[PDB]
Structure 1
Amino acid sequence: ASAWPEEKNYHQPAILNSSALRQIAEGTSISEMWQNDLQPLLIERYPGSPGSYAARQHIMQRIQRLQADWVLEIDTFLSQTPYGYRSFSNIISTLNPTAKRHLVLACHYDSKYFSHWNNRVFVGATDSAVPCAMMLELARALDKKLLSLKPDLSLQLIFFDGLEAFLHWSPQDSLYGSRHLAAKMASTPHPPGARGTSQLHGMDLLVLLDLIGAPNPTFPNFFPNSARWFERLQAIEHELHELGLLKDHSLEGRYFQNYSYGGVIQDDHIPFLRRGVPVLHLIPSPFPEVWHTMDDNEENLDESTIDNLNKILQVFVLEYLHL
């Protein structure tokens, strides 16, 4: 029995030099992302709604136009909810489907259901339209480098449906898409034809982006088994800063701070985490002040912060994949 599922434990990044770091910083466009990937998502899109369908089409369209050989799959399922049985659709975008290992980036694309109030509509800009757009921008910015993937390791993007509770958060009313996908992936042999390893053994690391877009986020180092990757984010943020490649940024106000978090934050990584998948949870603590209010909109997004995080994440991925 091959020990390939243990490779993630020893995987090391291929660190980019200064010139490559400048190249990545210049290759991403916050204004392009804003207009082409983010604004079309700033709409009401709770599960089963017309907005959900439109968001899903937008995400797929933006990935399909890229040169890299992305394979798109829509994982549609039924679940009981406080409003009865409903349909949900997770979006999975994968390079090299039969590749044994994948670094996974994820976020949820649904928005919490709220009835309109005083003509205001909830669109969850940081929760999680921005993370969705950051993943789309990453696919676009690194497209040429990702095309060269067409170490049996590649990249996968997951956009979960139904992260939000239809009412208030509870064990049975929340995490619909991830509870479903995690169970499905855990019972799917991988690579095809495998005897005893699942798609979950193939997940090197799950990088879950959530609640990003507000000013001054501080991401804690939640888990000891991914702490060495959290440190890479810190190193990348530090070098991009020292090279003058970040905007309105200081080390005192750095995003990746040295600090554990006792508790546990319920989010889409939970069903994966509890089945042994290593997770790097990029959710800030505390949550954005506009969390779950009509003010979680475009107007309250911090543009240079998102731009800085796009550069950091893009360098993290290139270094992880050795690209």
Structure 2
Amino acid sequence: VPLIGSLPEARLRRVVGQLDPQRLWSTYLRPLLVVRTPGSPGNLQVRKFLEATLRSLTAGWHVELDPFTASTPLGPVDFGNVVATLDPRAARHLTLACHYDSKLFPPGSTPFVGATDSAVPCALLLELAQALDLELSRAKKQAAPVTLQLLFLDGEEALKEWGPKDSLYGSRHLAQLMESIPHSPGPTRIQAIELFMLLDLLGAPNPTFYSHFPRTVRWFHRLRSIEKRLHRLNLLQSHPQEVMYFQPGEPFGSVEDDHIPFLRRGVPVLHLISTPFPAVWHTPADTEVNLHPPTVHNLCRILAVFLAEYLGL
């Protein structure tokens, strides 16, 4: 439905048409589907891949690492968050986030590559940035006062499921770091985050999302509206009912994740995580062949419209 603040149909269809499903799958997702536990060569290689892909965008993003070493159940480990801010001068930003590490499992099993968890989230952010690159470049050249920020967090997963401090390494570090860095008007980089939208556990068939935070329910309702509209406009696949993903009511459950260090510091959060979790969750079957590609692209389309409406692209 065409609500105030929504895209006119023509601008909606242009935006959706700038997505490239083969690019998402082959250019952004496939290279991530490797073991990428914190400290590993695979993790370093995925980090460098994210950085170089983000630097390649013609919009000219500010891309930096947040490297640090932390104590873990395995001893000291190095972590590195990838922080991409389209216009570092802007007063505030929409922040989209996900984790790029994969969960460590014991040797001797099929390697875990976390296709839903969170390779698909990562690839979605890269595809949105590329598909909207011209518009984002124009917004930045016009000094828009709300920019876009993408966070690819390291170390979300426990290394040994060794208690509550064996988790969220990257997000805990980056939230503390942002609290310590001045920003204008700020007064710190935490207050620059106008909304923190965390994507997690995406790409399985039949996801269900609930609003986890009354504070941000208006954005949850916008996602739901976009799902219904794309359905009606014949722009979703394998989507027989008008609303399938964005469900009303209390969450099936809520869970700790990379938004918590930000939430605790007063950042508004929308947690875009399937609850219940994918069937494959935390098993080595969380792989490419068990993703549901029409759902991946449906989510990409929903998010692209969301982003364009949020930032007036």
> Taking structure 2 as the reference length, what is the TM-score of the superposition?
0.95
Are 1:173 and 2:162 matched, yes or no?
no
Alignment correspondent of 1:108: 99
Task: Please identify, of 270-279 and 13-22, the stretch whose mean Cα deviation from structure 2 is larger.
Answer: 13-22
Kindly indicate whether the alpha-carbon contact (under 8 Å) linking 1:123 and 1:296 is maintained by their aligned counterparts in 2. yes
Alignment correspondent of 1:28: 19
Task: Please identify, of 245-254 and 271-280, the stretch whose mean Cα deviation from structure 2 is larger.
Answer: 245-254
Alignment correspondent of 1:73: 64
Are 1:308 and 2:301 matched, yes or no?
no
Instruction: Please state how far the C-alpha of 1:83 moved relative to its aligned partner.
Output: 1.3
CA distance in 2, matches of 1:170, 1:232: 36
Alignment correspondent of 2:77: 86
Are 1:264 and 2:254 matched, yes or no?
yes
CA distance in 1, matches of 2:191, 2:70: 25
1:275 to 252, 265, 273: 265
Q: Match of 2:150, as an amino acid?
A: L
CA distance in 1, matches of 2:4, 2:271: 19
Are 1:241 and 2:231 matched, yes or no?
yes
Are 1:62 and 2:53 matched, yes or no?
yes
Are 1:128 and 2:118 matched, yes or no?
yes
CA distance in 1, matches of 2:4, 2:135: 16
Alignment correspondent of 2:275: 285
- What is the number of equivalent residue pairs in this alignment? 308
CA distance in 1, matches of 2:243, 2:309: 24
> Taking structure 1 as the reference length, what is the TM-score of the superposition?
0.92
What 5-or-longer segments of structure 2 have no aligned partner? none
Kindly indicate whether the alpha-carbon contact (under 8 Å) linking 1:116 and 1:122 is maintained by their aligned counterparts in 2. no
CA distance in 2, matches of 1:251, 1:263: 23
- Aligned counterparts, 1:129-278, within 5 A: 129-148=119-138, 149-150=140-141, 152-168=145-161, 170-191=163-184, 197-251=187-241, 254-261=244-251, 264-278=254-268
Q: Match of 2:76, as an amino acid?
A: Y
1:14–1:69 distance in 2 versus 1, CA, 3 Å: farther
Instruction: Please state how far the C-alpha of 1:115 moved relative to its aligned partner.
Output: 2.8
2:43 to 47, 52, 62: 52
CA distance in 1, matches of 2:306, 2:203: 19
Q: Which runs of 4+ in 1 moved over 6 A?
A: none
Superposition CA RMSD, Å: 1.6
Instruction: Please state how far the C-alpha of 1:15 moved relative to its aligned partner.
Output: 1.9
CA distance in 1, matches of 2:177, 2:94: 18
**SS of equivalent to 2:72:** coil
CA distance in 1, matches of 2:168, 2:135: 33
Q: Match of 1:180, as an amino acid?
A: H
Kindly indicate whether the alpha-carbon contact (under 8 Å) linking 2:252 and 2:276 is maintained by their aligned counterparts in 1. no
Instruction: Please state how far the C-alpha of 1:34 moved relative to its aligned partner.
Output: 0.6
1:147-182 deviation line (CA, Å, top 9, x unaligned): 102351100000000000001162210000000101
Q: Match of 1:22, as an amino acid?
A: R
CA distance in 2, matches of 1:244, 1:15: 17
CA distance in 2, matches of 1:17, 1:158: 29
Q: Match of 1:38, as an amino acid?
A: L
1:58-98 deviation line (CA, Å, top 9, x unaligned): 11121122111201110001211111121110000111112
CA distance in 2, matches of 1:160, 1:13: 34
1:123-155 deviation line (CA, Å, top 9, x unaligned): 000000110000011111111111102351100
CA distance in 2, matches of 1:269, 1:59: 20
CA distance in 2, matches of 1:33, 1:169: 35
Kindly indicate whether the alpha-carbon contact (under 8 Å) linking 1:13 and 1:322 is maintained by their aligned counterparts in 2. no
CA distance in 1, matches of 2:101, 2:223: 27
Kindly indicate whether the alpha-carbon contact (under 8 Å) linking 2:228 and 2:242 is maintained by their aligned counterparts in 1. no
1:170-219 deviation line (CA, Å, top 9, x unaligned): 2210000000101111122112xx5x711111100001000101000000
Instruction: Please state how far the C-alpha of 1:263 moved relative to its aligned partner.
Output: 5.1
